[PDB]
Amino acid sequence: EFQSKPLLTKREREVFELLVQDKTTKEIASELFISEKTVRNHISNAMQKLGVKGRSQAVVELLRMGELEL
Amino acid sequence: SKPLLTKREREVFELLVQDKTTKEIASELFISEKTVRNHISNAMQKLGVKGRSQAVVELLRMGELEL
């Protein structure tokens, strides 16, 4: 309706939801049927969108924003 | 189940979730960057996880960190 689209794309969110369950990037790639490079690319793009340098800070910010659950 | 962090280990994570690099943490807590990495590693081992983000998520789960 009028709310803006989530900052994360669908696939970025899937990667992050696996990330918080302790999966390695190989396991995420295997689960999502994509290359590891693609997993890294998704993590990288999401952190450039949040303007943070590390995965920890991406997770925290995403959690603050309601874009990721736990 | 419930692993206990020392004062320093908790402090490092508390600073970590405020978007500080290890360099900055080292500066604020008046210790070396090596010592900061050591506290992080030892916390990760107590928590049974593989990286910093997983440590943060497990501490959030247990109620030992707040955002």
mmCIF file of all heavy atoms in Angstrom, chain A residues 19-24 51-57 59-61 63-64 70, chain B residues 13 16-17 19-21 48-50 52-54 56-58 60-61 66-67, unseen atoms left out:
data_model
loop_
_atom_site.group_PDB
_atom_site.id
_atom_site.type_symbol
_atom_site.label_atom_id
_atom_site.label_comp_id
_atom_site.label_asym_id
_atom_site.label_seq_id
_atom_site.Cartn_x
_atom_site.Cartn_y
_atom_site.Cartn_z
ATOM 1 N N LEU A 19 22.124 -16.832 7.734
ATOM 2 C CA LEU A 19 23.265 -16.277 8.458
ATOM 3 C C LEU A 19 23.100 -16.274 9.983
ATOM 4 O O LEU A 19 23.997 -16.749 10.676
ATOM 5 C CB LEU A 19 23.549 -14.865 7.954
ATOM 6 C CG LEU A 19 24.994 -14.577 7.561
ATOM 7 C CD1 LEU A 19 25.611 -15.811 6.925
ATOM 8 C CD2 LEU A 19 25.185 -13.362 6.672
ATOM 9 N N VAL A 20 21.944 -15.855 10.481
ATOM 10 C CA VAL A 20 21.650 -15.824 11.916
ATOM 11 C C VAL A 20 21.312 -17.199 12.518
ATOM 12 O O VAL A 20 21.106 -17.342 13.726
ATOM 13 C CB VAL A 20 20.588 -14.769 12.275
ATOM 14 C CG1 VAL A 20 21.069 -13.393 11.854
ATOM 15 C CG2 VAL A 20 19.239 -15.049 11.620
ATOM 16 N N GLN A 21 21.356 -18.237 11.690
ATOM 17 C CA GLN A 21 21.089 -19.582 12.199
ATOM 18 C C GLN A 21 22.422 -20.291 12.198
ATOM 19 O O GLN A 21 22.460 -21.515 12.252
ATOM 20 C CB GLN A 21 20.163 -20.417 11.313
ATOM 21 C CG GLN A 21 18.705 -20.043 11.401
ATOM 22 C CD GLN A 21 17.836 -20.685 10.322
ATOM 23 O OE1 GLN A 21 16.779 -20.146 9.990
ATOM 24 N NE2 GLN A 21 18.290 -21.786 9.738
ATOM 25 N N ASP A 22 23.490 -19.521 12.026
ATOM 26 C CA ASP A 22 24.831 -20.074 12.089
ATOM 27 C C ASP A 22 25.336 -20.804 10.860
ATOM 28 O O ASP A 22 26.310 -21.555 10.949
ATOM 29 C CB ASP A 22 24.927 -21.103 13.210
ATOM 30 C CG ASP A 22 25.824 -20.626 14.291
ATOM 31 O OD1 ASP A 22 25.373 -19.613 14.891
ATOM 32 O OD2 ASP A 22 26.921 -21.202 14.538
ATOM 33 N N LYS A 23 24.674 -20.616 9.731
ATOM 34 C CA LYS A 23 25.104 -21.326 8.536
ATOM 35 C C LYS A 23 26.294 -20.598 7.920
ATOM 36 O O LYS A 23 26.353 -19.370 8.008
ATOM 37 C CB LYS A 23 23.889 -21.336 7.610
ATOM 38 C CG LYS A 23 22.808 -22.193 8.243
ATOM 39 C CD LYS A 23 21.498 -22.207 7.510
ATOM 40 C CE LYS A 23 20.698 -23.426 7.940
ATOM 41 N NZ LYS A 23 21.649 -24.376 8.608
ATOM 42 N N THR A 24 27.239 -21.353 7.370
ATOM 43 C CA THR A 24 28.382 -20.798 6.654
ATOM 44 C C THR A 24 27.912 -20.399 5.262
ATOM 45 O O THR A 24 26.858 -20.802 4.756
ATOM 46 C CB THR A 24 29.495 -21.829 6.411
ATOM 47 O OG1 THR A 24 28.963 -22.910 5.630
ATOM 48 C CG2 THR A 24 30.065 -22.431 7.713
ATOM 49 N N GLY A 51 25.287 0.895 4.919
ATOM 50 C CA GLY A 51 26.442 1.743 5.129
ATOM 51 C C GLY A 51 27.237 1.302 6.344
ATOM 52 O O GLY A 51 27.739 2.134 7.103
ATOM 53 N N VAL A 52 27.340 -0.015 6.509
ATOM 54 C CA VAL A 52 28.140 -0.570 7.595
ATOM 55 C C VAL A 52 29.253 -1.447 7.036
ATOM 56 O O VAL A 52 29.093 -2.013 5.955
ATOM 57 C CB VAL A 52 27.280 -1.393 8.563
ATOM 58 C CG1 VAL A 52 26.358 -0.438 9.288
ATOM 59 C CG2 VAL A 52 26.522 -2.513 7.810
ATOM 60 N N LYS A 53 30.332 -1.584 7.802
ATOM 61 C CA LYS A 53 31.531 -2.303 7.377
ATOM 62 C C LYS A 53 31.547 -3.779 7.750
ATOM 63 O O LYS A 53 32.257 -4.578 7.137
ATOM 64 C CB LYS A 53 32.801 -1.646 7.917
ATOM 65 N N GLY A 54 30.730 -4.183 8.712
ATOM 66 C CA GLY A 54 30.802 -5.574 9.115
ATOM 67 C C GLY A 54 29.471 -6.290 9.167
ATOM 68 O O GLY A 54 28.416 -5.653 9.159
ATOM 69 N N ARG A 55 29.533 -7.618 9.152
ATOM 70 C CA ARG A 55 28.316 -8.417 9.190
ATOM 71 C C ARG A 55 27.573 -8.255 10.507
ATOM 72 O O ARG A 55 26.351 -8.260 10.479
ATOM 73 C CB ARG A 55 28.661 -9.900 9.083
ATOM 74 C CG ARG A 55 28.721 -10.467 7.695
ATOM 75 C CD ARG A 55 29.107 -11.926 7.795
ATOM 76 N NE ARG A 55 29.675 -12.386 6.534
ATOM 77 C CZ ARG A 55 29.767 -13.673 6.258
ATOM 78 N NH1 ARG A 55 29.338 -14.542 7.171
ATOM 79 N NH2 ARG A 55 30.256 -14.052 5.082
ATOM 80 N N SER A 56 28.292 -8.212 11.627
ATOM 81 C CA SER A 56 27.698 -7.983 12.942
ATOM 82 C C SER A 56 26.811 -6.746 12.928
ATOM 83 O O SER A 56 25.705 -6.803 13.469
ATOM 84 C CB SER A 56 28.702 -7.744 14.072
ATOM 85 O OG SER A 56 29.459 -8.889 14.436
ATOM 86 N N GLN A 57 27.348 -5.634 12.425
ATOM 87 C CA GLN A 57 26.605 -4.380 12.370
ATOM 88 C C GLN A 57 25.466 -4.481 11.353
ATOM 89 O O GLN A 57 24.421 -3.892 11.586
ATOM 90 C CB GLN A 57 27.445 -3.103 12.198
ATOM 91 C CG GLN A 57 28.727 -3.156 11.406
ATOM 92 C CD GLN A 57 29.578 -1.910 11.558
ATOM 93 O OE1 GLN A 57 30.785 -2.012 11.760
ATOM 94 N NE2 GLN A 57 28.958 -0.735 11.483
ATOM 95 N N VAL A 59 23.625 -7.142 10.841
ATOM 96 C CA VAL A 59 22.628 -7.918 11.569
ATOM 97 C C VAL A 59 21.904 -7.055 12.606
ATOM 98 O O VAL A 59 20.676 -7.047 12.739
ATOM 99 C CB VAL A 59 23.318 -9.120 12.237
ATOM 100 C CG1 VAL A 59 22.398 -9.816 13.230
ATOM 101 C CG2 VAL A 59 23.790 -10.115 11.186
ATOM 102 N N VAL A 60 22.700 -6.318 13.370
ATOM 103 C CA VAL A 60 22.132 -5.456 14.394
ATOM 104 C C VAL A 60 21.209 -4.420 13.762
ATOM 105 O O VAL A 60 20.100 -4.242 14.255
ATOM 106 C CB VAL A 60 23.251 -4.748 15.186
ATOM 107 C CG1 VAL A 60 22.696 -3.600 16.015
ATOM 108 C CG2 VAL A 60 23.966 -5.778 16.056
ATOM 109 N N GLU A 61 21.658 -3.744 12.705
ATOM 110 C CA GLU A 61 20.862 -2.695 12.073
ATOM 111 C C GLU A 61 19.598 -3.256 11.436
ATOM 112 O O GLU A 61 18.511 -2.717 11.637
ATOM 113 C CB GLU A 61 21.658 -1.865 11.065
ATOM 114 C CG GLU A 61 22.840 -1.086 11.628
ATOM 115 C CD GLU A 61 22.652 -0.411 12.983
ATOM 116 O OE1 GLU A 61 21.828 -0.875 13.809
ATOM 117 O OE2 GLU A 61 23.415 0.539 13.294
ATOM 118 N N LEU A 63 18.063 -5.849 12.410
ATOM 119 C CA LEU A 63 17.188 -6.200 13.522
ATOM 120 C C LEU A 63 16.500 -4.938 14.032
ATOM 121 O O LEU A 63 15.329 -4.984 14.412
ATOM 122 C CB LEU A 63 17.940 -6.872 14.672
ATOM 123 C CG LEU A 63 18.371 -8.342 14.566
ATOM 124 C CD1 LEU A 63 19.176 -8.694 15.812
ATOM 125 C CD2 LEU A 63 17.166 -9.270 14.489
ATOM 126 N N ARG A 64 17.207 -3.812 14.022
ATOM 127 C CA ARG A 64 16.616 -2.588 14.539
ATOM 128 C C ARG A 64 15.532 -2.106 13.598
ATOM 129 O O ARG A 64 14.506 -1.598 14.048
ATOM 130 C CB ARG A 64 17.652 -1.474 14.718
ATOM 131 C CG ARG A 64 18.436 -1.619 16.011
ATOM 132 C CD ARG A 64 19.409 -0.485 16.252
ATOM 133 N NE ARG A 64 19.843 -0.408 17.641
ATOM 134 C CZ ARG A 64 21.112 -0.198 17.938
ATOM 135 N NH1 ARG A 64 21.939 -0.061 16.912
ATOM 136 N NH2 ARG A 64 21.530 -0.102 19.194
ATOM 137 N N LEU A 70 15.078 -13.314 13.694
ATOM 138 C CA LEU A 70 15.632 -14.125 14.780
ATOM 139 C C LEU A 70 14.622 -15.122 15.353
ATOM 140 O O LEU A 70 14.187 -16.026 14.640
ATOM 141 C CB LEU A 70 16.224 -13.293 15.913
ATOM 142 C CG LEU A 70 17.719 -13.155 16.188
ATOM 143 C CD1 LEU A 70 18.531 -12.739 14.964
ATOM 144 C CD2 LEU A 70 17.974 -12.233 17.366
ATOM 145 N N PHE B 13 31.724 -6.736 23.352
ATOM 146 C CA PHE B 13 30.539 -6.932 22.523
ATOM 147 C C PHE B 13 29.586 -5.742 22.591
ATOM 148 O O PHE B 13 29.007 -5.344 21.580
ATOM 149 C CB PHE B 13 29.887 -8.279 22.855
ATOM 150 C CG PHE B 13 30.529 -9.377 22.090
ATOM 151 C CD1 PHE B 13 31.670 -9.993 22.571
ATOM 152 C CD2 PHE B 13 30.112 -9.616 20.798
ATOM 153 C CE1 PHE B 13 32.333 -10.948 21.807
ATOM 154 C CE2 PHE B 13 30.756 -10.579 20.042
ATOM 155 C CZ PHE B 13 31.872 -11.231 20.542
ATOM 156 N N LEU B 16 31.042 -3.423 20.290
ATOM 157 C CA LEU B 16 30.926 -3.953 18.938
ATOM 158 C C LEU B 16 29.576 -3.622 18.313
ATOM 159 O O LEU B 16 29.500 -3.135 17.187
ATOM 160 C CB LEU B 16 31.129 -5.457 18.998
ATOM 161 C CG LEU B 16 31.681 -6.097 17.734
ATOM 162 C CD1 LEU B 16 33.090 -5.551 17.685
ATOM 163 C CD2 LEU B 16 31.715 -7.615 18.008
ATOM 164 N N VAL B 17 28.498 -3.784 19.064
ATOM 165 C CA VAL B 17 27.209 -3.463 18.466
ATOM 166 C C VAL B 17 26.874 -1.972 18.374
ATOM 167 O O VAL B 17 25.752 -1.611 18.026
ATOM 168 C CB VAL B 17 26.049 -4.210 19.132
ATOM 169 C CG1 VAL B 17 26.305 -5.688 19.122
ATOM 170 C CG2 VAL B 17 25.752 -3.674 20.523
ATOM 171 N N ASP B 19 28.928 -0.180 16.460
ATOM 172 C CA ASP B 19 29.595 0.105 15.192
ATOM 173 C C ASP B 19 31.027 0.596 15.319
ATOM 174 O O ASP B 19 31.466 1.479 14.578
ATOM 175 C CB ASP B 19 28.782 1.094 14.347
ATOM 176 C CG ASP B 19 29.215 1.102 12.896
ATOM 177 O OD1 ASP B 19 29.430 0.001 12.347
ATOM 178 O OD2 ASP B 19 29.370 2.153 12.235
ATOM 179 N N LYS B 20 31.734 0.033 16.293
ATOM 180 C CA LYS B 20 33.130 0.371 16.544
ATOM 181 C C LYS B 20 33.990 -0.743 15.959
ATOM 182 O O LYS B 20 33.635 -1.917 16.034
ATOM 183 C CB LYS B 20 33.408 0.456 18.047
ATOM 184 C CG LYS B 20 32.457 1.320 18.872
ATOM 185 C CD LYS B 20 32.698 2.814 18.732
ATOM 186 C CE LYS B 20 31.816 3.610 19.683
ATOM 187 N NZ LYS B 20 32.149 3.483 21.130
ATOM 188 N N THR B 21 35.111 -0.397 15.340
ATOM 189 C CA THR B 21 36.048 -1.415 14.886
ATOM 190 C C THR B 21 36.902 -1.837 16.086
ATOM 191 O O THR B 21 36.781 -1.263 17.166
ATOM 192 C CB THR B 21 37.020 -0.755 13.914
ATOM 193 O OG1 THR B 21 37.717 0.266 14.635
ATOM 194 C CG2 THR B 21 36.285 -0.031 12.798
ATOM 195 N N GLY B 48 30.211 -21.164 21.551
ATOM 196 C CA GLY B 48 30.124 -22.295 20.643
ATOM 197 C C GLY B 48 29.867 -21.823 19.221
ATOM 198 O O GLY B 48 29.220 -22.564 18.485
ATOM 199 N N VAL B 49 30.310 -20.626 18.828
ATOM 200 C CA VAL B 49 30.042 -20.160 17.457
ATOM 201 C C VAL B 49 31.318 -19.876 16.667
ATOM 202 O O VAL B 49 32.410 -19.769 17.221
ATOM 203 C CB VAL B 49 29.212 -18.837 17.472
ATOM 204 C CG1 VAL B 49 27.879 -19.097 18.130
ATOM 205 C CG2 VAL B 49 29.986 -17.708 18.207
ATOM 206 N N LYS B 50 31.147 -19.628 15.379
ATOM 207 C CA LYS B 50 32.247 -19.487 14.426
ATOM 208 C C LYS B 50 32.657 -18.061 14.051
ATOM 209 O O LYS B 50 33.822 -17.837 13.702
ATOM 210 C CB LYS B 50 31.940 -20.312 13.170
ATOM 211 N N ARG B 52 31.813 -13.363 14.508
ATOM 212 C CA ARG B 52 31.401 -12.292 15.417
ATOM 213 C C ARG B 52 29.888 -12.114 15.400
ATOM 214 O O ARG B 52 29.249 -11.933 16.432
ATOM 215 C CB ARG B 52 32.025 -10.980 14.953
ATOM 216 C CG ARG B 52 33.432 -10.739 15.468
ATOM 217 C CD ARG B 52 34.124 -9.696 14.603
ATOM 218 N NE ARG B 52 35.555 -9.674 14.892
ATOM 219 C CZ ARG B 52 36.317 -8.585 14.903
ATOM 220 N NH1 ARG B 52 35.778 -7.403 14.610
ATOM 221 N NH2 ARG B 52 37.612 -8.700 15.191
ATOM 222 N N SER B 53 29.338 -12.112 14.196
ATOM 223 C CA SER B 53 27.906 -11.949 14.035
ATOM 224 C C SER B 53 27.181 -13.087 14.726
ATOM 225 O O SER B 53 26.195 -12.824 15.396
ATOM 226 C CB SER B 53 27.508 -11.727 12.577
ATOM 227 O OG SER B 53 27.328 -12.940 11.882
ATOM 228 N N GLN B 54 27.657 -14.328 14.635
ATOM 229 C CA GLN B 54 26.949 -15.394 15.343
ATOM 230 C C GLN B 54 27.008 -15.163 16.869
ATOM 231 O O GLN B 54 26.019 -15.458 17.552
ATOM 232 C CB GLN B 54 27.474 -16.772 14.914
ATOM 233 C CG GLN B 54 27.548 -16.864 13.387
ATOM 234 C CD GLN B 54 28.199 -18.105 12.794
ATOM 235 O OE1 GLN B 54 28.512 -18.116 11.595
ATOM 236 N NE2 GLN B 54 28.374 -19.153 13.596
ATOM 237 N N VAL B 56 27.158 -12.277 18.545
ATOM 238 C CA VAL B 56 26.169 -11.235 18.774
ATOM 239 C C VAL B 56 24.761 -11.803 18.750
ATOM 240 O O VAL B 56 23.942 -11.461 19.606
ATOM 241 C CB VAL B 56 26.292 -10.084 17.743
ATOM 242 C CG1 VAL B 56 25.102 -9.127 17.835
ATOM 243 C CG2 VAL B 56 27.614 -9.339 17.916
ATOM 244 N N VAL B 57 24.440 -12.627 17.762
ATOM 245 C CA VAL B 57 23.097 -13.191 17.726
ATOM 246 C C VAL B 57 22.880 -14.096 18.940
ATOM 247 O O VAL B 57 21.828 -13.992 19.562
ATOM 248 C CB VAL B 57 22.808 -13.962 16.413
ATOM 249 C CG1 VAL B 57 21.526 -14.786 16.495
ATOM 250 C CG2 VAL B 57 22.696 -13.014 15.211
ATOM 251 N N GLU B 58 23.845 -14.926 19.337
ATOM 252 C CA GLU B 58 23.600 -15.789 20.495
ATOM 253 C C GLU B 58 23.464 -14.982 21.789
ATOM 254 O O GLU B 58 22.611 -15.289 22.610
ATOM 255 C CB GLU B 58 24.671 -16.857 20.738
ATOM 256 C CG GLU B 58 24.855 -17.857 19.615
ATOM 257 C CD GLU B 58 23.696 -18.830 19.480
ATOM 258 O OE1 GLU B 58 23.024 -19.110 20.499
ATOM 259 O OE2 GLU B 58 23.486 -19.322 18.348
ATOM 260 N N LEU B 60 22.237 -11.992 21.982
ATOM 261 C CA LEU B 60 20.930 -11.338 21.939
ATOM 262 C C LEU B 60 19.883 -12.336 22.404
ATOM 263 O O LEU B 60 18.988 -12.018 23.191
ATOM 264 C CB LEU B 60 20.564 -10.839 20.538
ATOM 265 C CG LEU B 60 21.385 -9.592 20.202
ATOM 266 C CD1 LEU B 60 21.087 -9.163 18.766
ATOM 267 C CD2 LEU B 60 21.100 -8.497 21.228
ATOM 268 N N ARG B 61 20.024 -13.563 21.925
ATOM 269 C CA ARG B 61 19.098 -14.620 22.302
ATOM 270 C C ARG B 61 19.012 -14.874 23.800
ATOM 271 O O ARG B 61 17.920 -15.021 24.331
ATOM 272 C CB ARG B 61 19.482 -15.914 21.600
ATOM 273 C CG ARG B 61 18.921 -15.955 20.203
ATOM 274 C CD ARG B 61 19.387 -17.125 19.364
ATOM 275 N NE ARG B 61 18.828 -16.920 18.034
ATOM 276 C CZ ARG B 61 19.174 -17.636 16.981
ATOM 277 N NH1 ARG B 61 20.050 -18.617 17.168
ATOM 278 N NH2 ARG B 61 18.636 -17.395 15.789
ATOM 279 N N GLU B 66 21.758 -5.824 24.564
ATOM 280 C CA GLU B 66 20.574 -5.095 24.148
ATOM 281 C C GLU B 66 21.002 -4.204 22.999
ATOM 282 O O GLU B 66 22.143 -3.731 22.952
ATOM 283 C CB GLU B 66 20.066 -4.194 25.270
ATOM 284 C CG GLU B 66 20.015 -4.941 26.588
ATOM 285 C CD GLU B 66 19.856 -4.015 27.773
ATOM 286 O OE1 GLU B 66 20.832 -3.290 28.069
ATOM 287 O OE2 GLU B 66 18.777 -4.061 28.397
ATOM 288 N N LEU B 67 20.054 -4.017 22.090
ATOM 289 C CA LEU B 67 20.170 -3.067 20.995
ATOM 290 C C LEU B 67 19.290 -1.880 21.378
ATOM 291 O O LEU B 67 19.374 -0.789 20.808
ATOM 292 C CB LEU B 67 19.640 -3.715 19.716
ATOM 293 C CG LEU B 67 20.330 -5.033 19.356
ATOM 294 C CD1 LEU B 67 19.908 -5.435 17.969
ATOM 295 C CD2 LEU B 67 21.844 -4.890 19.399
#
